[PDB]
Write a protein that binds this DNA or RNA. Sequence first.
RNA 1: UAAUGGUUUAAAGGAUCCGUAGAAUGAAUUAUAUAUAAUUUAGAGUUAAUAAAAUAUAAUUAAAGAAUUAUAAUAGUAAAGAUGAAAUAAUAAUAAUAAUUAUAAGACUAAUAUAUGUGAAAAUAUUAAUUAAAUAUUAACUGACAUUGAGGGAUUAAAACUAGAGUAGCGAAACGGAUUCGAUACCCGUGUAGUUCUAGUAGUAAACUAUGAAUACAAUUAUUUAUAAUAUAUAUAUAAAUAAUAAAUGAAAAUGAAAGUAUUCCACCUGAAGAGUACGUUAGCAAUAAUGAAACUCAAAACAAUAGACGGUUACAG
Lengths: 91, 125, 56
Amino acid sequence: KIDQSLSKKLPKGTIYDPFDFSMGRIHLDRKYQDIMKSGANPLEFYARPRILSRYVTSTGRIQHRDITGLSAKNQRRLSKAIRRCQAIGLM
Amino acid sequence: MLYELIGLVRITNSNAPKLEAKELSSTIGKLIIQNRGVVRDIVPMGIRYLPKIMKKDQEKHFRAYHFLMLFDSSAAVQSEILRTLKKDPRVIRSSIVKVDLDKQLDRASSLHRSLGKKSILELVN
Amino acid sequence: TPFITRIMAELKEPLVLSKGYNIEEVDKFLAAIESAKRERIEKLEDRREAILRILS
RNA sequence: UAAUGGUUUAAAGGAUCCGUAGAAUGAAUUAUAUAUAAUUUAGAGUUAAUAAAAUAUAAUUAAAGAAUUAUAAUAGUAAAGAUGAAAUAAUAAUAAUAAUUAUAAGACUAAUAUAUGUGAAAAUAUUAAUUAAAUAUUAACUGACAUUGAGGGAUUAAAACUAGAGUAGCGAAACGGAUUCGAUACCCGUGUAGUUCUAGUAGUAAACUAUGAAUACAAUUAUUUAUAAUAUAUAUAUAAAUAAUAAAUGAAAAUGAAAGUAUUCCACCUGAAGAGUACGUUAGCAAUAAUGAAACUCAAAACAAUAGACGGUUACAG
Ligand SMILES: [Mg+2]
Ligand SMILES: [Mg+2]
Ligand SMILES: [Mg+2]
Ligand SMILES: [Mg+2]
Ligand SMILES: [Mg+2]
Ligand SMILES: [Mg+2]
Ligand SMILES: [Mg+2]
Ligand SMILES: [Mg+2]
Ligand SMILES: [Mg+2]
Ligand SMILES: [Mg+2]
Ligand SMILES: [Mg+2]
Ligand SMILES: [Mg+2]
Ligand SMILES: [Mg+2]
Ligand SMILES: [Mg+2]
Ligand SMILES: [Mg+2]
Ligand SMILES: [Mg+2]
Ligand SMILES: [Mg+2]
Ligand SMILES: [Mg+2]
Ligand SMILES: [Mg+2]
């Protein structure tokens, strides 16, 4: 067998080109690799530690907007919700 | 004003953990209704492990019965309720947050509003 | 001054409702809802009292 | 014999805003002699509705969190701590340091984060509540009610002072240990005042964008940011901010929607030094703050840029 990284699995029902059978395709795939990214207000999840534990680190540090990819407003609301959750004995 | 209380009641009686939370809710609700208030919801959260070993007064806890209460009351009685909560050994953590009614008279709790049910009318349909 | 005092007193009267509601209109509206429902008692009193408490 | 000036950096924007006088300035149409009168809504306002987290700001009250220090124990043993390396009158055999618990006290606020924003500025980002303020667009309404603003008023970092609390950490002064030719310094150790809170006084900062406020206008692009649509797509329109610019300006650096084109009102400047000094006055418990000279001396003094030299300056090569 060979390492799965070095191989490319062409999905089912998809068209392909001969290029797809090449290291170029895998390399191009590597280089070019939710609830809050929506109309939902993150400040309504302040009592739901499971949901907003996805937007923190293993130690609990809120993730930068560069990571979360949220809008500025939803980043601010999410940070407020996480801090409030930390204060009220959850989180 | 509509307020949302989220209490973390202690559970010392292992065989019936909900016993404390029921009488907490009864006391707070009696206070609210006898002070020209209204109680809209008493949504129970379950028994959950606290993130840390939280020490209310001089006893350490590792888990608690979480519960939510949505109630309409005035500012003075809301402060009184918070006062009673803070000086109660049964309660480990407490928090009261306003739910703004400038748009809608009817509004669901934070949990139901997060699920998608914006108001109690949706939640009863 | 009479004006300021009368305005504040009228604000402090009982059965004064916020959000532009009037107690007479509210009572008539609730009775109209019930009569319309018939045309298509303590529980209704509790509903009325809850409404007046929320709108107080 | 130069104001046919200036104030980001050469001298010069008031810390900020509010607002009185102004013998300051200021919309539209018509009529009659710059005014009066009647009309108008484009500036400036008021009240609703709608949307949005008006979340952020201010005061108040109520909470949370990591850590630090000390105290007590538990076991365990000879070093620990600090430094460039060491040493310290008060580290450890009186069992220390490290570890694990348990109590106590103060102060602070990790991530998010950009101070994005909010606030007149100073400031302001752990949580919640009360009160107060702040957004856009529509509807209706007032009919110039505006701008600026001498004097005045209010607020105003850090330090400082007066009382009363508090004082864990940090830490002026002081006392010691080093280093040094010397140490009065940088470094190390104890550490008072202060830093914290309450009630005040004081009103200064490179209180800075070193850039006063308002109004009208001027070529682009790209980003966001916030609304309004239209069916993720219109690389969607309308605003603000940010970034790079055209023109213009400018001693240039550069500014760039203002340091451009204009208008209005206020503040300020007039060589260096003497000097923000002296004297006086006012205020303040004081420290001080404000106001603020002159003689004497000189042909200096400063700003931007240019080319070098130098650097206990960077990177790359050989
Ligand atoms: Mg002349
Ligand atoms: Mg200079
Ligand atoms: Mg200057
Ligand atoms: Mg200024
Ligand atoms: Mg100045
Ligand atoms: Mg932070
Ligand atoms: Mg003014
Ligand atoms: Mg500061
Ligand atoms: Mg002080
Ligand atoms: Mg004192
Ligand atoms: Mg101290
Ligand atoms: Mg020290
Ligand atoms: Mg020296
Ligand atoms: Mg020292
Ligand atoms: Mg004062
Ligand atoms: Mg001074
Ligand atoms: Mg000054
Ligand atoms: Mg100039
Ligand atoms: Mg002086």
